[PDB]
Amino acid sequence: GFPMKQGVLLPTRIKLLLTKNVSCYRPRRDGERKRKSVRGAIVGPDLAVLALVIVKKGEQELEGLTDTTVPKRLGPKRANNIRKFFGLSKEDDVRDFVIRREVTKGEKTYTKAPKIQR
Amino acid sequence: LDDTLFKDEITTFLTENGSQSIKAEDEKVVMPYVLRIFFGRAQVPPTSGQKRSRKIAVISVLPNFKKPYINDFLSLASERLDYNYFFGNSHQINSSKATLKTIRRMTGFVNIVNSTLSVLRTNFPLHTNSVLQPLIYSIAMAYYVLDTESTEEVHLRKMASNLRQQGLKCLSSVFEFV
């Protein structure tokens, strides 16, 4: 049950000090330094799950890899972000090009767009 | 180039006969780059207290190099400037370009020359084609706008008047100084 943390060169579980703005450690009370045990950065013969990321495609279309594709659930908030997404300019408003998300409620068909930040 | 390390880093190595100086031929070679960056830092306006201290630091740093070096700096100032129409003619300038941009450049120039005289009062040099032509050049079109423009251009009239005042003041001070 212990995780992998980048930086500590040992293939052994270590009791380190873990802090606020770092990985693997989500403290309850704000800002302190607690002592916690994490499994060191060198992968050894005792690990259980390893996380790897596809970078360059090879030969095989794999279903849960290549065939599946989630859409991004959320969308932009800022008008300049909308500009950067769509290739807009300073002059045209984005009230018409804000993303339109459609919802149903029984048979009523309502829809929403976010409040434009800035 | 960094701003938060600008002044301190200048005093770290750019101060002469101390720690980490620059060799003769090399420093001769890297004159233009120092000149360009210091011209940029001068062209930064002193609209805040930090920018005030930065401009004060810039002008305090400048006069410690050497006479041809600061002459080259003043030469780059004149090169941003010009005197060609006025001094190919006697006193006439054919291209009637006395725009607000031109006079703004002139006022920046008279600001920096006021700065360098005030820092190197009894020591700074006077190159002929470097100071004399742009000074009376700027004063000439200052009075040209003062004469040929009515009060409808309060913007032009105000900063032409201040341009005239500063040019005359620095002319008087350079006379007192050299």
């Binding site: - | 301190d8 005093t11 101060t15 101390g18 305090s60 410690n64 009062r121 009894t122 020591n123």
Partner: protein
Amino acid sequence: GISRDSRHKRSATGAKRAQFRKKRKFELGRQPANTKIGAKRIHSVRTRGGNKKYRALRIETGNFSWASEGISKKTRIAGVVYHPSNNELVRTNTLTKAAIVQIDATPFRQWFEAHYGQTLGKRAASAKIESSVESQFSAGRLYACISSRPGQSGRCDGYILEGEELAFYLRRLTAKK
């Protein structure tokens, strides 16, 4: 901790009294900053209220003045040569208030010769400055008195010595030499 109470000194009668309370927060004494000379590293302390008090532990550059004609520039320090409190302090060169330092002469002589036109040593009446002053101009190493608490201000301000001050300090050095 390090306190500045009176709750430990002997009474004026000359007897030891009773312990009163655990030592508080406001009656605190912080840790003394032996400010050395070097790459300027400043450290902030949050003191009572929202007050910020700076402790620079090292420095090269201080702000120095002549009231001889009223000029003041930021210069690079050189060394510690006297201080009335402790010989060890003078030795290890941990600058304090009222310290006697050797300071550079270069920007000051640059201003002097750019402001007068007369070479130092080697406005006439004002140009007849003091002889030991121009001798130290020739030496390139001036005597200054840091007259500011560094471990409170986080700054280092000094003034170059003048006649009777320089006289007594020179006498101090020549008696200690």
